[PDB]
Design a protein around this ligand. Sequence first.
Ligand SMILES: NS(=O)(=O)c1ccc(CCNC(=O)Nc2ccc(Cl)cc2)cc1
Ligand SMILES: [Zn+2]
Length: 258
Amino acid sequence: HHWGYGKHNGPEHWHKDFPIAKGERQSPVDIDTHTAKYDPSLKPLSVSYDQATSLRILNNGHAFNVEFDDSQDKAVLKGGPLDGTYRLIQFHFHWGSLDGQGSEHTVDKKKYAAELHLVHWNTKYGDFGKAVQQPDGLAVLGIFLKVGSAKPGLQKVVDVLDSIKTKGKSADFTNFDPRGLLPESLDYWTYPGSLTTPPLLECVTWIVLKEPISVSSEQVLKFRKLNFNGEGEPEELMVDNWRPAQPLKNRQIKASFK
Ligand SMILES: NS(=O)(=O)c1ccc(CCNC(=O)Nc2ccc(Cl)cc2)cc1
Ligand SMILES: [Zn+2]
């Protein structure tokens, strides 16, 4: 009886195994655009993905992860609210059963169809497992997806999904360029938070881009054909793998833009 996204094991149950679920800096949150304060001390984000080396795509039973070789300083996030250098390790998405839900963060209570998470770890801690134990260990770049025009840079991901339908399946996934998933503007909101899945560790500087990317209905429909279950088990479509907004508590969301 492990955690997941159902009546019996979904987000409202997680606190029993992971009491930090009711902690002081949990994610995601609703971004109230009127109360987020412009912070002129924030820097432009530096996204340096020219040398990113993708290796593999994995269905982990909760989402799919596109994994990168993070054994060198090949793809890094810097600047913005961050001190130092954060290395890209993987990206994944959260999405809905329908276009009206799926994102984890919300904007004035608006839910997007999906949300991309580009996960980076602080190189001062030497590796990912050590970084998640630190309050400034991770930087996750969050990008909203809306349904409209196709995102050409996503289609290589969409087309490999048939080969990792079920939990525990993986496939070679080299030479994927995540620059193709970025919107035009790097305007962002930022706040201190957590992993949005167990173990819910409070180790994340969240950087959420204001501008969504557009994907086609056919693209997101293919996400919704994945399975939470393993091969040969009863089919449970991988949809609604998002955690709802959590209490903001004593935190301030800062905007990089006027
Ligand atoms: N949805 S998200 O972007 O917030 C997000 C990003 C990354 C993860 C990482 C999962 N991996 C992990 O939990 N690693 C770990 C945990 C405990 C020990 Cl003891 C050792 C290693 C989860 C959520
Ligand atoms: Zn995530």
